[model samples]
Target chain A: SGLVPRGSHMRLRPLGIEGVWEITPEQRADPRGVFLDWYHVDRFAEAIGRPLRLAQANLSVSVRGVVRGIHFVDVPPGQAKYVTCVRGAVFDVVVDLRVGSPTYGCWEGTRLDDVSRRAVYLSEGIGHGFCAISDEATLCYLSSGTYDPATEHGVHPLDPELAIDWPTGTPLLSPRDQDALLLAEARDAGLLPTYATCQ
Target chain B: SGLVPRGSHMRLRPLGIEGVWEITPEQRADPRGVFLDWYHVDRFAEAIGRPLRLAQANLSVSVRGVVRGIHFVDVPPGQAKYVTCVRGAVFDVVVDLRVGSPTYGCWEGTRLDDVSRRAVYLSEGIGHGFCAISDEATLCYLSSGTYDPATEHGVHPLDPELAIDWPTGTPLLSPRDQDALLLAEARDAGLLPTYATCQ
Candidate 1:
């Protein structure tokens, strides 16, 4: 365990990726269930290094074994996402797509579900994907930018070269996700966002 | 059924509320499963009589019995949303909060699950919410503005005065939603979006 900031309401740990973090907010669990301040502005500023400017927030429920994404938006005006599982849980994974980062092409996984109430913050130029481990896995997240179809892109989550250890077997994928390019193919096609532009 | 426009790829129906619509995109089912074009800007423009300038896109996942949001944003640059269920199913509800709308305080429920692959277009000055009827129910939507906490507001979904016939028993709601003001209280406080500004 690492030392946490004294003034913050959540514990943030750096994931393997440089800008991505695993955030565990202080939860108050009782007989009724659990409660946590999922977004605390003051606390977030301290933890994420910069204050969050929430552009959008959303929720999604995926059945067991279903997977979505490896999706990313262009940098320079990149998208930052704060993701969590509200009702159920998922094995949330982040892939470093910024070409020059030390952990480029590397990935990390965190379990976010109702019980622990953990969250992942993927700040710009990273690929995100998740698989539902339970029959009732529900995933929700906040984004830093609006959706623009032209600015968004994805790599196949099951691309063998990336070899993401998604923590589940035979993920049921969407037609679009299945048709996405491999990392090398995407990079060669000038699709990967660079670290310099992101900074 | 209304006659769909010949140029469009999907069917669009008015939801009885002035600004709300029910969208049924043409689905292509293969041996493996089913696929649908959930959003087509050209088709949407034809149906809604305007272009959607999406400021954000969101996804929410919920477990069975989990209910979220009788939530809305202020008008005069109000929030508009396009909602769909990607996994499992939900009882989606839209409430007309426009102070003078004929349907004010009245609500409509639509079942948007993977099978029907239906969607809802919620124009400005409306409140939106849903319950995850299946074990894993996922909701996705597009919004017209960035999230400004100050501009967002909510009303109690279970308020007896509104009398929303939510077709489920004992929904699990958030403390914020549970504590929200009733419709009359919210309107009297001038917290709701007005019809004039929305148009």
Candidate 2:
């Protein structure tokens, strides 16, 4: 019986996935250029309807064509990330590798650029990575769980099926990422964890 | 310089449209149905760094072939909406009706069902509506501004181009919704409110 008026704005959708949220930037324009606040702790807590405990904050700077990841967790202290493009642009992508998930092996992509000032949210037991689209792209992230080097894993950015069209031509990659396995190989070897097992 | 080990479970994205959020649900099996909470709020507010104030909440119930909306603001009391589906299913959608918006006239849709448990957040100055894909569908929403009868307006669900595919049959519509104007007609007559002109 509750009804918001016909023209009323502000809608909140429940993603069902615990601890994930996608937010839009509020703009404060001026003659010099538009100024906007991209992050505010309290307001976000209201949007997702829960209080998030932040353990660490990280930032990465990548040059155009620099493919950073297609990475995920291994076991024991698996990780979760909250990411956004702070400067420049990037093509953010996420893949569902959770075994029993309906969207398992399915992926969704979004453009995070200055023009849109957008970001993406990925849930635990999922893979995370992005391709820098601008000359200099900066990605900022906050983690719900702290980092543990021993449990990290990754797949090739150029995996045939993922075929991420990263803009950088002479893309640079970490030695670990460069040695990543293909999606099929990862799946067959049980490298990709599912919600049931991961939990 | 910090990094989360692979196998991480969650990721959050920042959307282009301010005041908007897209949420996806997690499907699980156990003694409980889908156990979940608003997981994205705190992180989302931190991303945008704003304390969003919610003033109203709405729930829309519709049956198959029932089309509601293409509805939006009347300015002077502009509104914003946070939308989601609670039961059955729907293809929730939004349009950038804000005059002078670079992405003006563009539209986006997300499938909201028990399986995905996703929702979309919409800011003010945009037109909103949804199509029922199930026998009975329920949409829940929250708004930022109070409702003012004089400032509300609507566009037809059947507006060509927007050609939203509502499940076919004798469509059921409210007496008020049945009289909405076509997109072309609305745009030409300046019925849609511009973001800049809104307060």
Candidate 3:
């Protein structure tokens, strides 16, 4: 009974953190099924003020209590990501790691689920992460840059400085993620990019 | 355990019909979860010959028994679609409806499901449709052209001439689909596009 007819337009709302936006595409449904445009370049350019460069598209399937990333890229061609949960549910997080920004160290979280069908877009230089909250969650990512292990970087999800309010669980982390540098550690090592570049 | 290490390269196989190819991406799984590249432009261009125009991206969700289309578009800007099932399962079908073609009446079906994580690409002038085999199935479509009602056309999914092997069930069809013309009827009405134009 939660069904209602919707338009073809999409609504974009800024998350608490700067450079982060939540997008909800208008969904159309009928007796046969449902139809919606997940990503339209023209509409996106009009709303976000620039086009999204789709250099790569990646998908990940995660089980409940699994967390991935606080990942970012080296600036100069920093990676921006547009992510949506295609199936089940996920708690997506975006952490501002841009140096000399007012919102630096701040984070925003969105519960992306199939029911809401909302997506989160993170600009370059920002740290991104997510936790699977459903039995199985499928996430689709449209990345602005190609994946290069040399430039890819991450901060510990459980970094005390960030203190992200992740879902309470016996969380699982990849070996690499478990050994990721802490936010402060990365900052001290000059790994954080300048906010001016993204601005 | 059906899990085995897979490479980053994608494997493409002809789906028993010309202009229809099934793509299976290299899925990488880790202790935390699974990661895979669903759509990579460089790899696609090399395999498919030419590029996939991502003019529009559409997603659909269907319940069991739902049959969406045997739909195609008018040539000379005909729509080409790359589709993948993100959740649950569907019996995806591609029909050859082009006039003056050897495989004019031939069709191919693929069991699109989350388990296989396979995708199917259909060139212009081909008719496409699917039947939801799972309780809920989510299908994602990336089209080369924007949707235009004027050019969009369809033959009945239950058309006797085409006789697509849809899953056995009381199919749920849209009103338009229920009243759609049969393959022969569309051909006689000069609605089916010419094969020469596509080839």
Candidate 4:
């Protein structure tokens, strides 16, 4: 968590990944732990200086060792995401999968847990994923476009050259996630988003 | 379960809720539990006599008695949903919230469980919801439009006149669900979609 500016209640900062932001909202605490407004469209827009267009809201619960993405959609109708962990915790990551971005092939991780109540916002063309470090880790995220299976794609989470340095446990992944292509394979095959167009 | 006509591998039938159809795909069971293709795009298109334009895909998990919605989106950019339960069970329901139609005000419920692998396809302008009967019940659904909160609305799941006859248990509801207006109230407030426009 970072300190908020003198007149503001939120600490909005860009993570190591370009186009990815981590937002920590004002919280109220008592005998019942704490309460935070994880998402408020108006505040989101004001903070980012742009309207947040929502296409979908998804909630997922996974037990320990479950790794669920590297998922992304193509540009034009590219996907953006606002992610938060609701129940337990997860090691959330954002990958700059856009072909020509300065940070292309780079990734960053955020420890999103219930206690800190941090949420991440990544604009179109980035790729996202997370691993459940605790049992019953629940995540709620918003997407900017509907799911068009044909347009949706992913990179293999364990792609060697990307070398994501995930935690110690073996990740249990979906068959599709496990079988996804490597970064070079995907790029060479013309499957990655173009940063210029996304901007 | 419903009947399948000659040479067909499935059954698609309308429930009391207009434009809402229950789909039962062919299944096979063994010493294990059961297996079926809960979804097939082309098959669905042929049955509905229209193309299913998918905008988003959502997965939700609810504990027992969790009543999630009576949610709908206004027509013009109305939402059509293809809903199914992948784990545990739920009393999936649809309501005719479109202002004037043959089945206006009518509602119907379908029990979706991993066993039968049943699913429901509902066209735009209808309201939908479900009650999780088993702990960790999971639901997966498809939407035809991306989320537009301004276009989203819901009725109280337990609205008296709708008389849904939901199964036993104290339903745990979200603040939004708990505070939703009745169908008549929503209509009077000009919140209901028009059947003509939806069609």
Candidate 5:
């Protein structure tokens, strides 16, 4: 972890993707371990100019090389996510897949580790995924929508057009993730959301 | 660790303290470990008939016998807390310290451990504290107020009037906690909040 000075408040940094942000919660460490504030409502709202309504909270534990998603939901009731790795490390990423957008294929990646206790927030219409880099990585998600399989869709993590520079190695993917649509196929099939609707 | 069947939704039970509640999040386990939904905004609001305005989130790591609080803030903007023990165990307690309340001086305790993944919420005017029973216990707090030392006060954990049955051991306390006022002393000095104002 870098020896950057942290104040008594949560810090926010904009990622390259338009609607993606990297957040560092205020952390205090001592003999045993560390204590930190993972989320603050008013502080987050003031910084992001939008409120997060916590509809569901989820936990995922994955082993090294496990890749989860490049997932998104339909617009009108789009899903937003706030994620953090609690136990180990993961190269978490967000990709802009909104159709007819300036940075439609842009992606940003951040290493979330237990030591730094950093988190990321992605707005609606953004595709999110992560690759666990440690033996075991436990991630927590505070979401703005409950899971609805009917409205959810995913793009292949290894889509050649959106060549995301994941950590070097073969990614272990679930059967469903392996069969996910490519970026071109998703856009052509009208499975991807529009930038105007998301805005 | 009971055979009680849990549904897809979070479960809530009323603790003896008027404004206190015990919540068990929906948990799913597999070979690696477990995944659970710790909090849901709409589900909680519909159940409690109120919303949790997330002001601040805090973490505390304590060793065995360590007793941190019997603390409360002033009324009007009284602080509400949602507490959960993420690692190890703690005998968490809540006292009805609000003056002129039916449950005045009454206290409730719950065993918060990683196994059950249970959490407790105490509305304002209640005195909250805990004693770590395991070698090391980690606790997380979601509070409705920022820490304001000037408006914060504590009651002596071992005060005879509120004889809270903590785990069997000599409690390890901070100098300030050891010197905190008793419930009667605080009430007499007009330091304790009134039940009416808390509503």
Candidate 6:
């Protein structure tokens, strides 16, 4: 009906999380190989009718079997993430720790590899972590809220129930991560914050 | 070895698909917006390591409560996707359907809204779909491989096992989707193609 005519390639879906989203990029390839730009702010604004305020950008580099996180934010300033693997490869995982959500305790993962140039967008109140799959892995992240040490939290990456298949063999873990509590312990100690309270 | 310093942001991740990417113009209430352009050819070549051969550009439009797909290509001739939302909002979902892969069947969702203007990269064997959340939605997708009916495949959106909440009430499904097989049924019938075979 509108003469402007709409773009046919775009697809829209509601994420259970408020003010959060997952975006897919258009791919272009040929005899030499493939290529594409992963982000364009205007297109997104046109879709959601609001502008994103990027507070901080973080990047990490690790080798295979290096497990970094199972990390989350505390009650007052729970963090939200827009993450992607820039180089090498990784198994990025997101756990819905939001207490009242239908998908609570459920986990989902996506491959962030050098060749795919793909990324994952994580909403607040969720646990974020990744395991390196390639020899050298690099991850880049943009946070909606700035890092606040006082509000930061984490769960053990080795929690039996999580049973995340972190590239077999001994993984390289940080002292804080190695000493972290399991989901049960974290929940029992009143350490796990509720999604409703965070808001 | 390079003086620029090896950093995560400098490396490019593989998307497994091929296509050209374009950022749309955005409007801001605070008079704050960012814009830049690299000669089209240079940008595409640098992102994917080779010049992109754009075969065609396509668009899609949808309304709220629409659940489109869990779609991808078959072996011998697989298609790659380059997608971005032009208007309204959507939760873009990507699942690694590759067999034997540790992260296979693991999926992640991100919002493709009117804010970040970001795009996602999906490979040939990965399953792609979206759930529309706004009144009206528009998206643009570019494909490296031509459309082939024989090579296209899909899965039911309401598979309790998969449990994908497509944000629809009495979902508006296509004739093909309404009759699409369930995940278990599809898998049993050899309709669920593996990434290994596609590649």
Model 2 reproduces a share of the real contacts of 0.00
lDDT by residue (tens digit), candidate 2, B74-164: 6656776666565568877787777777767667777876445565767678789777888767555556664567788888877786776
* Every candidate's lDDT: 0.76, 0.62, 0.85, 0.74, 0.82, 0.60
Candidate 4 at residue B21, lDDT?
A: 83
Query: Any residue pairs clashing in model 4, and if so which?
Result: A55-B147, A146-B55, A147-B55, A147-B56
Model 1 pairs in collision: A58-B59, A59-B59, A59-B60, A59-B61, A60-B59, A60-B60, A60-B61, A61-B61, A61-B138, A146-B55
Candidate 6 regions exceeding 4 Å error are: A1-21, A30-35, A42-50, B1-199
Q: Model 6's lDDT to the true fold? A: 0.60
Q: For each candidate, give its TM-score against the true structure.
A: 0.57, 0.46, 0.92, 0.55, 0.87, 0.46
Model 4 alpha-carbon drift over 4 Å, by segment? A1-14, A21-63, A66-89, A98-100, A111-125, A135-163, A171-198, B1-16, B21-63, B66-89, B97-100, B112-125, B135-161, B169-199
Q: Cα deviation in Å at residue B172, candidate 1?
A: 8.7
Please tell me how candidate 5 rates in CAPRI terms: acceptable
- What is candidate 4's lDDT per residue for B1-199, written digit by digit as tens? 2221122255677777667888876554322112244455556667777755545544565667777679999887788888877557899988888887988888888898755667899998988988888765766666667667799999999898788877756887877888999888999999999999988
Error of 3 at A85 (Å): 1.0
The TM-score between candidate 6 and the true structure equals 0.46
Q: Measured against the native two-chain assembly using Cα atoms, what DockQ does each of the candidate structures obtain, in the order listed?
A: 0.07, 0.02, 0.67, 0.05, 0.43, 0.02
Candidate 1 local lDDT, A1-199, one digit each (tens): 1211122245777887888888876554432233355555545667777766554444455667778789999886899988877656788889999999888889888888766667888889999998888775656566777668999999999988779887666778888899999999999998899998887
Provide the clash count, candidate 1.
Answer: 10
Per-residue error (Å), model 3, residue A98? 2.1
> In candidate 1 chain A, where is summed lDDT lowest over 10 consecutive residues?
A1-10
Instruction: Please state the CAPRI-style docking class of candidate 1.
Output: incorrect
**lDDT score, residue A194, model 1?**
97
Interface RMSD values for the candidates, listed in order? 8.1, 18.2, 1.5, 9.5, 2.8, 16.0
The alpha-carbon deviation from the true structure for residue A1 of candidate 3, after best TM-score superposition, in angstroms, is 6.8
How do the residues B38-123 of candidate 1 rate in per-residue lDDT, one tens digit apiece? 56555677789986665544456566787777999988768898888766789999999998878888889999986676889999
lDDT of 2 by residue, A109-138 (tens): 667765555545555777887888887665
Clashes of each: 10, 65, 0, 4, 0, 53
- Specify the highest-DockQ model's number: 3
Q: How good is the docking of model 1, as DockQ? A: 0.07
